[PDB]
């Protein structure tokens, strides 16, 4: 399953959020299987069938309301009959008040159970009417209903493959010139946010490299001598953390292959793709998003990017400073020595 490079999603500012004009939290919901996203919608087919679908939705709402009113009438008549019967039995009026409050509670519950269905239908119709690409649907049941009803009209997806599709269905030049039109004449409050977006987009435009590189289909493995596994004098072994990260990536990817072969339920496959995403994220920059993958003893494992960061990174530790033919010893004053 495709995966996103954590450097361009979680790294501030979010490069993907600047390219697709998507908010960082919305992108976080998309990648890690918390909200679906609409990749495409056949707007002309929706227009040519809007009247029929509207009539069908109205008929469904009318049927819901009719069922509600019938059930409410039945319950109210049963309540009145029960009160008359308990009056014929001669029970005290306070017990009749108890039965009355119970009946009113039941009728309230029925009316609310119907109103919730009416509101669900209202939201379904409203979402399908105003459906456009790059829209997010955090409610999973709402998206399920949308696919069950108007699945012929739109296409949506989750995870990183959805963002891959969005990058594929993205006009670089058109978005660049739209940002330029906003930049030429605009209010600074809303113009600076477009200036930085253009800074991100014009690079992909001019350079000639596709933004698709931000989503990975294959991940490279560093040669083994740079992540060596040594043997200990006690017979046991000690390996590099990069080996553990690569191993977890491999494990979850093979499990995902098993789930794809077996046709496992979509819940398991999606929850596995999320774990594969987090594993690649830990391999490249562990701890960048959320809590870091801890090894034995609650110690955060070092990532690939950790090989280059700070004073202990490759640059400052092995490039800016390194030597043979050298020594050191305690110093002692020598008055008889000449200055040279």
């Amino acid at each position: 399953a495709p995966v996103t490079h954590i450097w361009y999603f979680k790294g501030v500012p979010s490069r993907l959020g600047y390219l697709l004009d998507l908010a960082p939290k919305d992108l976080e919901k998309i990648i890690y299987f918390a909200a679906y996203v609409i990749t495409s919608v056949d707007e002309e087919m929706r227009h040519n069938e809007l009247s029929t679908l509207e009539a069908e939705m109205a008929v469904e709402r009318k049927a819901v309301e009719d069922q509600r009113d019938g059930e409410l009438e039945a319950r109210a008549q049963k309540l009145e009959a029960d009160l008359a019967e308990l009056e014929a039995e001669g029970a005290k009026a306070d017990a009749r008040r108890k039965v009355r409050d119970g009946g009113e509670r039941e009728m309230r519950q029925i009316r609310d159970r119907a109103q919730r269905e009416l509101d669900r239908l209202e939201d379904i119709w409203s979402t399908f009417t105003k459906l456009a690409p790059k829209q997010l649907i955090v409610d999973e049941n709402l998206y399920r209903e949308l696919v069950d009803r108007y699945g012929e009209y739109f296409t949506g997806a989750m995870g990183a493959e959805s963002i891959q599709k969005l990058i594929e269905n993205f006009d670089i030049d058109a978005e660049a010139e739209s940002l330029r039109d906003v930049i030429r004449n605009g209010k600074g409050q809303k113009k600076l946010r477009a200036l930085k977006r253009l800074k991100v987009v014009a690079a992909f435009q001019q350079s000639g490299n596709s933004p698709m590189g931000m989503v990975l289909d294959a991940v490279p493995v560093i040669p083994p001598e740079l992540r060596p596994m040594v043997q200990l004098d006690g017979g046991r072994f000690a390996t590099s953390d990069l080996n553990d990260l690569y191993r977890r990536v491999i494990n979850r990817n093979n499990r995902l292959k098993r789930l794809i072969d077996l046709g496992a339920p979509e819940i398991i496959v999606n929850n596995e793709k999320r774990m594969l995403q987090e594993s690649v994220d830990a391999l490249f920059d562990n701890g960048r998003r959320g809590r870091p993958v801890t090894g034995p003893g609650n110690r955060p494992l070092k990532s690939l990017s950790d090989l280059l960061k700070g004073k202990q990174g490759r640059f400052r530790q092995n490039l800016l400073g390194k030597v043979d033919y050298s020594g050191r010893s305690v110093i002692v004053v020598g008055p008889q020595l000449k200055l040279h």
Partner: protein, 174 residues
């Protein structure tokens, strides 16, 4: 129908929503690694999907079966493969870094061997550089140089002793 196939996915999602987090907490205590607890949860629910006998009866607690399966998985992880490797990390402090010795002795020996090689005939040198530097067989050198088998044998036999002569004349330790 197709709804019959969708009902199974709905059922799996329901058992997810009711047991996944608690099973994750249990596996998290037994292992101490959250990334391992997620794997245990995925595998346990996968085995739950493969056993309709556990998902059939709702009046019987499937949570206990899930905990038992997770416990067995976790104890299976705790054997040989973990036994040997799980101990040390190179990034972790307290582990000595690997080192390689210097090539001083090898370079000096190479220099002396080159000097002793220069004082050999073109034939003997071209044979010892094909037997020891290229690692060919006797018949391979005989085929390349267009000479006899015993010829290569004798050339090697003498060139070895000539190099020994030169080295002992220069004081090379036996």
């Amino acid at each position: 129908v197709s709804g019959a196939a969708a009902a199974e996915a709905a059922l799996m999602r329901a058992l997810y929503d009711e047991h996944a987090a608690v099973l994750w907490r249990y596996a998290l205590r037994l292992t101490g690694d959250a990334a391992q607890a997620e794997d245990v949860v995925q595998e346990t629910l996968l085995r739950a999907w493969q056993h309709p006998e556990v998902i059939g009866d709702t009046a019987r607690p499937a949570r206990a079966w899930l905990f038992t399966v997770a416990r067995n998985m976790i104890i299976d992880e705790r054997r040989s493969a973990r036994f040997r490797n799980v101990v040390g990390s190179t990034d972790q402090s307290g582990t000595p870094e690997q080192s390689t010795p210097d090539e001083v002795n090898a370079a000096l020996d190479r220099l002396l061997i080159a000097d002793a090689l220069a004082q050999l005939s073109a034939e003997h040198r071209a044979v010892i550089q094909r037997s020891y530097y290229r690692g060919w067989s006797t018949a391979q050198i005989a085929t390349d140089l267009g000479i006899a088998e015993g010829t290569v044998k004798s050339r090697l036999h003498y060139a070895v002793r000539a190099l020994r002569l030169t080295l002992q004349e220069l004081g090379v330790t036996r």
